[PDB]
Amino acid sequence: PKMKTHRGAAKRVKRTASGQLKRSRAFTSHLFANKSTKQKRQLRKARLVSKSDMKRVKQLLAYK
Amino acid sequence: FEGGQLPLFRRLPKRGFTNINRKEYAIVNLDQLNKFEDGTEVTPALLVESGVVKNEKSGIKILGNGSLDKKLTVKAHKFSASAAEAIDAKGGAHEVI
RNA sequence: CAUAGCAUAUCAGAAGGCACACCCGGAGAACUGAAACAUCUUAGUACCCGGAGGAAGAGAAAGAAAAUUCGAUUCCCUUAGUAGCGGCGAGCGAAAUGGGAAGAGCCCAAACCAACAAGCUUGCUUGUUGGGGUUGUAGGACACUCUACGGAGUUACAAAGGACGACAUUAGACGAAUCAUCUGGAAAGAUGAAUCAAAGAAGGUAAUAAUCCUGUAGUCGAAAAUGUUGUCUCUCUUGAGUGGAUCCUGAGUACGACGGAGCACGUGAAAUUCCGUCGGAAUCUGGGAGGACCAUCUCCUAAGGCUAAAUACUCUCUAGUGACCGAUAGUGAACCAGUACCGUGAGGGAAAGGUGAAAAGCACCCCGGAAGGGGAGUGAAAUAGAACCUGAAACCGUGUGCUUACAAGUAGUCAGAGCCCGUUAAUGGGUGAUGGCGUGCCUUUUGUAGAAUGAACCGGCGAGUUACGAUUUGAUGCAAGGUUAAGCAGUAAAUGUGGAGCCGUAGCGAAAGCGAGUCUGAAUAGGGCGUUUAGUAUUUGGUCGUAGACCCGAAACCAGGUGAU
RNA sequence: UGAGGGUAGCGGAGAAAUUCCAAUCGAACCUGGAGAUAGCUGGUUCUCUCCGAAAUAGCUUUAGGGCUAGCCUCAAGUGAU
RNA sequence: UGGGAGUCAGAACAUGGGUGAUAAGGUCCGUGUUCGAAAGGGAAACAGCCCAGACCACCAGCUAAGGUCCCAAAAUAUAUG
RNA sequence: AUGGUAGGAGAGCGUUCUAAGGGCGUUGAAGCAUGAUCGUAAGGACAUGUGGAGCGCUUAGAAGUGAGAAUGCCGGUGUGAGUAGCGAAAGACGGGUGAGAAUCCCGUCCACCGAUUGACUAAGGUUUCCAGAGGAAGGCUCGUCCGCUCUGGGUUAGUCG
RNA sequence: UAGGCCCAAGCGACUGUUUAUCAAAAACACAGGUCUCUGCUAAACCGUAAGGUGAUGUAUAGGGGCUGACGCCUGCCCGGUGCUGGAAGGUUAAGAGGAGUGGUUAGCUUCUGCGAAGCUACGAAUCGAAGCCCCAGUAAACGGCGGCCGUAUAACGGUCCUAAGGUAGCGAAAUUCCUUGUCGGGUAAGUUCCGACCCGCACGAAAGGCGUAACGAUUUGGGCACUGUCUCAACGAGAGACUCGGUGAAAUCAUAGUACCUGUGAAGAUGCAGGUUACCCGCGACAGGACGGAAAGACCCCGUGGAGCUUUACUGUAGCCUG
RNA sequence: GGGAUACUACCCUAGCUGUGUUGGCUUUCUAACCCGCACCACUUAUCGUGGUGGGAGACAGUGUCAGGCGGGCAGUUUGACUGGGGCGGUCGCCUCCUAAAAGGUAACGGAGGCGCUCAAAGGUUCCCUCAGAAUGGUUGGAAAUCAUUCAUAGAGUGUAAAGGCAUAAGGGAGCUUGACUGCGAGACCUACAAGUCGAGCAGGGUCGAAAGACGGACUUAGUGAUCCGGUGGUUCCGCAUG
Numbered sequence A: 001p002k003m004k005t006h007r008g009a010a011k012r013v014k015r016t017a018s019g020q021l022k023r024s025r026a027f028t029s030h031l032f033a034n035k036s037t038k039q040k041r042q043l044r045k046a047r048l049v050s051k052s053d054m055k056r057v058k059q060l061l062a063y064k
Numbered sequence B: 001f002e003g004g005q006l007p008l009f010r011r012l013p014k015r016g017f018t019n020i021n022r023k024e025y026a027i028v029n030l031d032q033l034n035k036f037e038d039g040t041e042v043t044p045a046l047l048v049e050s051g052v053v054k055n056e057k058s059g060i061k062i063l064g065n066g067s068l069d070k071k072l073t074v075k076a077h078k079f080s081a082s083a084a085e086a087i088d089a090k091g092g093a094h095e096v097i
Numbered sequence C: 001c002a003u004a005g006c007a008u009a010u011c012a013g014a015a016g017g018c019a020c021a022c023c024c025g026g027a028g029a030a031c032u033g034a035a036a037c038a039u040c041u042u043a044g045u046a047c048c049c050g051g052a053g054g055a056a057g058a059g060a061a062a063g064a065a066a067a068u069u070c071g072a073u074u075c076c077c078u079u080a081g082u083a084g085c086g087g088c089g090a091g092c093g094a095a096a097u098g099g100g101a102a103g104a105g106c107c108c109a110a111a112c113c114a115a116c117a118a119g120c121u122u123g124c125u126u127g128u129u130g131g132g133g134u135u136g137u138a139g140g141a142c143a144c145u146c147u148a149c150g151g152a153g154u155u156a157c158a159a160a161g162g163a164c165g166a167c168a169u170u171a172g173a174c175g176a177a178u179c180a181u182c183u184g185g186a187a188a189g190a191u192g193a194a195u196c197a198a199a200g201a202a203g204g205u206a207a208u209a210a211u212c213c214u215g216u217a218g219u220c221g222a223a224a225a226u227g228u229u230g231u232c233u234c235u236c237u238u239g240a241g242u243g244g245a246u247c248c249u250g251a252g253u254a255c256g257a258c259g260g261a262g263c264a265c266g267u268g269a270a271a272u273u274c275c276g277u278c279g280g281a282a283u284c285u286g287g288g289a290g291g292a293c294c295a296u297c298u299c300c301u302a303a304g305g306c307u308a309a310a311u312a313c314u315c316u317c318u319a320g321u322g323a324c325c326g327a328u329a330g331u332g333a334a335c336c337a338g339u340a341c342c343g344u345g346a347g348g349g350a351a352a353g354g355u356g357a358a359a360a361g362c363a364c365c366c367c368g369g370a371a372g373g374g375g376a377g378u379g380a381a382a383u384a385g386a387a388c389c390u391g392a393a394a395c396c397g398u399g400u401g402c403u404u405a406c407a408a409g410u411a412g413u414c415a416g417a418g419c420c421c422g423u424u425a426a427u428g429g430g431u432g433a434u435g436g437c438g439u440g441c442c443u444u445u446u447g448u449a450g451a452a453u454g455a456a457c458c459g460g461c462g463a464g465u466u467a468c469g470a471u472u473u474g475a476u477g478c479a480a481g482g483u484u485a486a487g488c489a490g491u492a493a494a495u496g497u498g499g500a501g502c503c504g505u506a507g508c509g510a511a512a513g514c515g516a517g518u519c520u521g522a523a524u525a526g527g528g529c530g531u532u533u534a535g536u537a538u539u540u541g542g543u544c545g546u547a548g549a550c551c552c553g554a555a556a557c558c559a560g561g562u563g564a565u
Numbered sequence D: 001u002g003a004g005g006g007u008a009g010c011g012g013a014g015a016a017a018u019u020c021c022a023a024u025c026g027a028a029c030c031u032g033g034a035g036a037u038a039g040c041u042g043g044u045u046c047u048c049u050c051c052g053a054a055a056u057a058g059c060u061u062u063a064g065g066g067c068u069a070g071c072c073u074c075a076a077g078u079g080a081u
Numbered sequence E: 001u002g003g004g005a006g007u008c009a010g011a012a013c014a015u016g017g018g019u020g021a022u023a024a025g026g027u028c029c030g031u032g033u034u035c036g037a038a039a040g041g042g043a044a045a046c047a048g049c050c051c052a053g054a055c056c057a058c059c060a061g062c063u064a065a066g067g068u069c070c071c072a073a074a075a076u077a078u079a080u081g
Numbered sequence F: 001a002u003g004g005u006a007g008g009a010g011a012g013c014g015u016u017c018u019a020a021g022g023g024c025g026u027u028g029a030a031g032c033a034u035g036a037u038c039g040u041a042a043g044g045a046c047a048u049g050u051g052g053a054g055c056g057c058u059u060a061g062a063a064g065u066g067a068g069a070a071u072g073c074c075g076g077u078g079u080g081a082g083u084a085g086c087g088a089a090a091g092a093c094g095g096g097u098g099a100g101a102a103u104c105c106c107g108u109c110c111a112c113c114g115a116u117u118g119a120c121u122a123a124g125g126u127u128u129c130c131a132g133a134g135g136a137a138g139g140c141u142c143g144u145c146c147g148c149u150c151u152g153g154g155u156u157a158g159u160c161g
Numbered sequence G: 001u002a003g004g005c006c007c008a009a010g011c012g013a014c015u016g017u018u019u020a021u022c023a024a025a026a027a028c029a030c031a032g033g034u035c036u037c038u039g040c041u042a043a044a045c046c047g048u049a050a051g052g053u054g055a056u057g058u059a060u061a062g063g064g065g066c067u068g069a070c071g072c073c074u075g076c077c078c079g080g081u082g083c084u085g086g087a088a089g090g091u092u093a094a095g096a097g098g099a100g101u102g103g104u105u106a107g108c109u110u111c112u113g114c115g116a117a118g119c120u121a122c123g124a125a126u127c128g129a130a131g132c133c134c135c136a137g138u139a140a141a142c143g144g145c146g147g148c149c150g151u152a153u154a155a156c157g158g159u160c161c162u163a164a165g166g167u168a169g170c171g172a173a174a175u176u177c178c179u180u181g182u183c184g185g186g187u188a189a190g191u192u193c194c195g196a197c198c199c200g201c202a203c204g205a206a207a208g209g210c211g212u213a214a215c216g217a218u219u220u221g222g223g224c225a226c227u228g229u230c231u232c233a234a235c236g237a238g239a240g241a242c243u244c245g246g247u248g249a250a251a252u253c254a255u256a257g258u259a260c261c262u263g264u265g266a267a268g269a270u271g272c273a274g275g276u277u278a279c280c281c282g283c284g285a286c287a288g289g290a291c292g293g294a295a296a297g298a299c300c301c302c303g304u305g306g307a308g309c310u311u312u313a314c315u316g317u318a319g320c321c322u323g
Numbered sequence H: 001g002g003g004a005u006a007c008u009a010c011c012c013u014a015g016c017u018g019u020g021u022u023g024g025c026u027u028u029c030u031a032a033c034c035c036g037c038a039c040c041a042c043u044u045a046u047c048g049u050g051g052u053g054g055g056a057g058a059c060a061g062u063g064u065c066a067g068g069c070g071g072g073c074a075g076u077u078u079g080a081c082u083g084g085g086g087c088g089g090u091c092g093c094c095u096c097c098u099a100a101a102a103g104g105u106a107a108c109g110g111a112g113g114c115g116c117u118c119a120a121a122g123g124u125u126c127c128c129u130c131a132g133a134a135u136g137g138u139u140g141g142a143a144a145u146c147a148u149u150c151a152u153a154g155a156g157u158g159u160a161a162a163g164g165c166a167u168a169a170g171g172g173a174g175c176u177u178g179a180c181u182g183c184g185a186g187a188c189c190u191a192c193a194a195g196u197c198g199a200g201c202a203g204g205g206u207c208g209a210a211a212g213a214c215g216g217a218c219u220u221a222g223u224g225a226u227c228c229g230g231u232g233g234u235u236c237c238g239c240a241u242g
């Protein structure tokens, strides 16, 4: 039958134009006072899923 | 599965929501309109008949990517500023349906 | 008194067995996955019970939706592995829309009217019968207005019950056309010369047959029959339109609280739909729905019922098909099969095919108690003789050429006299006095001659496969375009048709949205993703995912039964 | 001690031993779920050619398992790095 | 850049070190080699030591490590102790 | 340039079946057996015997496509090996029958059980009962014998249960 | 054919019963005690329930727990836990009351708070029985019966703290680490046995203490009788055995022409090196090796494998109590 | 005076009229209901049905809801490293040595620390500079304070150790809050997740005369994802519309 999609990844990541996956950043949503404003604003910058992780999680998002 | 190390899609946080009633528009650029003749009046049905648009999703939208080099009148739902400008520059009109 | 209850007459209405494969209800697991486990999952699965049936179930809006709307139900393809649910983990997973198969809306209660009997005094009520009518941008009764077999429809809603005009026209019958020679035990084979074909499908006949037989194509055909098909007697429905002002329009119902279950939804805001316990309404100026709740709008009118088709399965039956098996295969069972046999019992459950064309199946003689045999004879063949096609290897023997009783051995290998033979005839074969070298195979291991594992020998059987989806390579076609799915016509094909849908032609952003740019930012700055061409359809290989997923192997868990001989 | 009977597995019987319940019992036997699951052991069948490792960091209810990196191979491309 | 893997039990020797007892064919790191996965010659036999990397024939030759009395190829060689 | 285990890549040999074409076969197919043959390998021919009806070749296409090991399953057959064993007990002789006698029949003697190796009756078994015939198989040897085989017979109730 | 006997210690009173198939006993039962529950549709138990046992019985009865004839006895602690009872001091869910607070509306100023009438979701002021807290009792209920320094609560002293700190009688015991404790008896010689001592690591009074006639296929020590048990083996009888005739398996098995020594090596060699010995083939005997056969080690570790039992492990639950 | 009787729950000390009716306490009644309750008939029959009499009685029993108890029963869990396992000990981060002159590098190898603190111990502008030693003196701890000279960081630096510090990074004083907003070419480290440093650009500020310095402390520890839930803003979205 059809392949099924990993929903937790689906509502965590999106697919760019070429083939890449754009993610959100961890170490947010909680204590920042220990952190600096630099860390705060820099954890707002987006990043891509690494290729080493793509080699593992490719099939989970084929229909994305 | 990473052997019990927390997987990537639980290390990472979720974000966003999906708009269930979202408007998507069939896209067409100026470089596609050059196949027509000057003075012609193009419409969505004429686009579909010419095969430039396979599917009218929520309307048709005209974008200013290429070069027109023509003169015609257009009737569509939405336009881009550059598109309307480049239509009127060579001569022509844009009528929002 | 009355009926229970009891006692008679008539009828046969049910029980049991289903094919529990499919369908509907009641009840309802666990192993398992989550790399433990409890919510979850396995799964409303397995098993049990009850019902019916040839189908069952559902079904005609108190709907689906927000267009300017839509077709009662069911089924197929898509929407889409989307939206959503989720220790937001494992995983679960729609709907509308659209394209299609099949296409069917009918009846009650209540109003109201006319009769019937009892109470009552025939006024009213009660109940019985009959009409009448069952639907919303409101239908019917009363108020208002003028028509019925025109059409004619038994698949519900009435019926011709009809002369009704091939069940399949089915058992069945007919059904063209060949001779010779050679080999042979026997020709259908070889050679040569002819023929039929709406018949060259197939099988038998002493070997391989279109013309030898049964048959085939095709034609003619009768009972139970009718194909259930065409005017088909009766009977049908040729409508009566406006306002709806008044009356009616399904009560312990809807709805609510608590506890639960089912809906893709984890029980909670549950919107929606069901069970139990408690409460408990409105009546057309009404009531319900449109994912808490309020208002405006849109749609509908519950608490009454029936309903064909398309759909699901096959213990069976008829006619057939196969890049399915061919006796350790294929049904457990080609034969004596659910049988010998095992077990107290529930239950488990085998092995076992082949003489030859024809039985012509060995008259007779000899040895022998007979079994066995040797002749003779049948036969094409008897090392084809019933322990009967072919007849492999292990294993058991009899004969022989070379060789061996001073020798230490993974038994071979390289060298090499002597002796014997004479080939797919090529710098051949068999044996091997003697010399040199040399601790089997497989698996598991840092490392195995290993005193680590496995194999007595031989033969046979015995393990990455298929479906669906994803990804990537190669091939081909077309190319800013590429492509159909279901269905329909067709030989269970190719093909043709079918454009709902799918990918691509533009991305960025959580999103509104903007657009070759967008997001951030107060700012265009700076930076991130992007542009500054090439995809798409089928197929080949590789890999992955879901399914038992390369094969054998647990202790155990659960459900239903069997046993106190 | 005999003949008839009774008690049935989440159960029964036991002058009590985890003892007996058809040569079996710390939970009988037969069928089915079921091809349960098995990060464990064993096995996995024809030939030649080219190349050719590792037994290591790091995380892990993790230690004889697994994931990513390292090191192998095949194909495209850049092209002195 | 992408397709496909396997591996995560390592062993000895030499050298630098911890530990141990300036013990272990011990154990733990680091630097090299070999075995693993490597036949051949030598070390008597002997995975890890020395030499050296087998495409296949040849009753041809030159060498390495190790050797030249016999087993068993080659000096009972020379010269000096 | 060409040692090589996990492993990656490539090229090939064979097996069954199908399509098409072209062929072989009672003047003897496939299978089986032998051989001193060909090919770098998997493997392919030829000749002769046996056998007595189907089978190759070329190109392509599909797979139940190749076994030496799984304390694997099923059948045959060995080794141990002429080995262990032949299941408590007194037999001897004569005569007979017979192809054949330690083992069968008859006779004499001897011996054993003797609150039993005795005689009845229930349960259970179900024709093992009786006459003839028989020696293929069964009998732990033999066998002329038999609870074995074949043929044919046999169970009688008012009072017994 | 037909009882061996005596003396002395333990355990158990006795007869009986028990692990079919390695345990027959000191283990179980027992008759007697004791505690507790139950006033009859009794309690208790089986069952979803209905119906049953208890019992065609009725506190001199029935169920359950501990102990285990008989005799002498059965000591201290109610602080903790359990059970019973009481005061009822206070705390609570469902529930009855709705005081107030907000979403929404022509409703009121239309720039805006009476929330009014109303539809709606929240909501304390009260109470609300069990339970819980508290008090008392109960030890033949669960349990406990000593720390510290003079000294080996040993003797008496104190204190530590809770509720108390071992009465009788026993005692190197089925209990004693040091241990073959010490002394005596018995023997030529006594890690055992008997008697005595107490320094009871860690005895103790119904998970009963001490003692007891009778009993025992019980444990233990000593003596008499008697003997091949032994010094020390010998001879005979049968059956297997061995030879002959008939019949004729099995476990095992990679192939086998299968020597020894010293070494080597996965560190213990028929198979490797160097030597030593050794004509080919049988039969009867033996058991040193083939790490012999037999059984995918039951000891040990491992598996995010199972099962059984336990509890103040987590989560539930039949059921019980109260509303 | 210690409250405290204006008006007002209002009142203990009070006795006190009955009310549409409603909502609690305790008795008594009976027809519901219950009697393994007595007699009488079905009956053949103690089951059961029915009549009469007696008991009990709106309690009990049963249903639904709630709370407490509940190894009686069930499903499950009960870690790893480890010179076998167990007992013991440890599990994250920082600093030295081991470590073999880049970096990195193991052991149940050797030593120690962290799970913060500070509104000045932060920023800026100005000034200032050790102990110890003797010397010598009221005090004298011999040395506390005071005074001259060498002292080379042996001083001191909030906190372990190491690397650094007189540019003082140590010690005081005056102002002040840059312990700001939005980005950041590029680099370090790295399996991933993460972690680290950054010139400079806009904006708007503090100190200083000014150049200029300030995106927290001499540097390196002083935490921990994700899901869930809560609070505030918002230009976002959603149901037909609000």
Ligand SMILES: CC[C@H]1OC(=O)[C@H](C)[C@@H](O[C@@H]2C[C@@](C)(OC)[C@@H](O)[C@H](C)O2)[C@H](C)[C@@H](O[C@@H]2O[C@H](C)C[C@H](N(C)C)[C@H]2O)[C@@](C)(O)C[C@@H](C)C(=O)[C@H](C)[C@@H](O)[C@@]1(C)O
Binding pocket: G294, G295
């Ligand atoms: C009579 C008939 C039986 O004889 C025995 O039981 C003898 C008497 C055991 O002696 C022994 C006797 C006794 C003391 O052990 C020595 C006891 O310890 C064991 C359990 O049984 C034997 C030999 C055991 O071996 C030993 O088993 C041990 C687990 C490991 C031991 N190991 C060293 C290789 C091994 O030799 C082991 C279990 O029986 C053999 C298995 C195969 C059996 O069960 C076999 C088939 C038995 O039925 C046997 C033939 O029938």
